[PDB]
Amino acid sequence: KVFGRCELAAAMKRHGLDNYRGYSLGNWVCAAKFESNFNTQATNRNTDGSTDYGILQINSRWWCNDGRTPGSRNLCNIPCSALLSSDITASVNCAKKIVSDGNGMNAWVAWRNRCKGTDVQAWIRGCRL
Fold this sequence. Notes:
Elements lengths: L4 H10 L10 H12 L6 E3 L5 E3 L4 E2 L29 H11 L9 H7 L14
Antiparallel strand pairs: 1-2, 2-3
Helix pairs in contact: 1-2, 2-4
EC number: 3.2.1.17
Function: Lysozymes have primarily a bacteriolytic function; those in tissues and body fluids are associated with the monocyte-macrophage system and enhance the activity of immunoagents. Has bacteriolytic activity against M.luteus.
Family: Belongs to the glycosyl hydrolase 22 family.
């Protein structure tokens, strides 16, 4: 599913991401835009042989099982394919664990390079939330 911007903002707000660990909703919308283009089905192979899955590009070396990432963990206890659903519940639940992990939203390279230090509230402008 390719989400609209405000459609994803509303879904992320319902699932409790607004201000989760002090990250305003626009941080999460901006991250999704630059990680996945708002596409739940996005997948990208990494150099290390892991893959990133879904709207928040959650990596198979630590967080989910894809059966092809040797020596990896599955800390969200989910198949990586669950993070490709039109329902973002599994991605949001796992993202809440990731952002609690130590480096905060710096775990998302697109957030760090394209959202951090910017006017991230622009990403929820116009949305009825």
